[PDB]
Subunit: 169 residues, 2 copies
């Protein structure tokens, strides 16, 4: 029934992410640059993706020097920002990107939507194209969208890959 359809459709998306291992490794590499020095990685999450924050403070793959973005803290060129956002039209995201640009702080943007001009400002972008539901209906509408689940899965991957790199040092 619904559980099996949702699970199999969700896994379909996980499999197709394998085709973008390189773009995801570009994200990891960008972030790892902070950790080779005395920079920090900051997660700056928007909307529903604010649910990612407890993964860094309370989660099983948490790590020192990967932390929640702090309002009003000036970042520096050695720091790196990981952004998860539902879309790139948000005014709060735009204000943050203007700040990072002024600080010369690089950022990876992971968007639930498609590729946009704003997304292209990121040195390590990823367009998930996963902003519509997985269960189609009668009228052309769709529902059942495990969007936070996808982001959380990706953050687990990123954290695990970063920690694996760090241990190798």
């Amino acid at each position: 029934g619904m559980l099996k359809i949702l699970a199999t459709q969700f896994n379909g998306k996980l499999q197709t992410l394998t085709k973008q291992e390189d773009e995801l490794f570009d994200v990891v590499r960008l972030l790892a640059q902070a950790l080779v020095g005395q920079g920090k990685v900051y997660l700056d999450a928007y909307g529903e993706f604010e649910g990612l924050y407890p993964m860094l403070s309370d989660g099983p793959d948490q790590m020192k020097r990967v932390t929640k973005i702090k309002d009003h803290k000036t970042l520096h060129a050695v720091d790196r920002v990981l952004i998860f956002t539902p879309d790139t039209e948000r005014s709060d995201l735009l204000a943050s990107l203007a700040r990072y640009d002024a600080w010369h702080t690089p950022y990876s943007i992971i968007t639930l939507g498609d590729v946009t001009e704003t997304l292209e400002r990121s040195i390590a972008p990823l367009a998930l194209k996963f902003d519509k539901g997985l269960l189609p209906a009668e009228d052309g509408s769709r529902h059942g969208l495990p969007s936070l689940a996808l982001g959380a899965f990706l953050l687990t991957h990123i954290l695990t890959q970063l920690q694996e790199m760090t241990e190798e040092w």
Copy 2:
């Protein structure tokens, strides 16, 4: 190919869940009982699962009468509580179950751990047995635990099923 390995490990768990469709239906039916009357469904999430809260307020499958548990608010027998917790040993969890018991409010407990006496206090429990990493290390230790991802996937399923049922009415 870390990404593909984590994806396939995670999917292995998704596949075993789909064989527990009946226990998950027990969760959904218990919660749906609130929606027949004037009661509400409350999410009471612990530890890393506090990351689920933004799904109810900002997520794609949000619905009016499924909301975050409120501090100090006395619930009634027509309300329903959905709990996600890393384990059933937490003193805050036990203190909450004592309150719900005093108020005669039914609760569903989804635990990342195994079946316990405390879990069996729930009329609709689910033990995820998903509290150790998916990627073994030389240590014997395990890393890469997409625990929030699983929780978020399950909340999407529950939200989407409650909405489909509510529409049928």
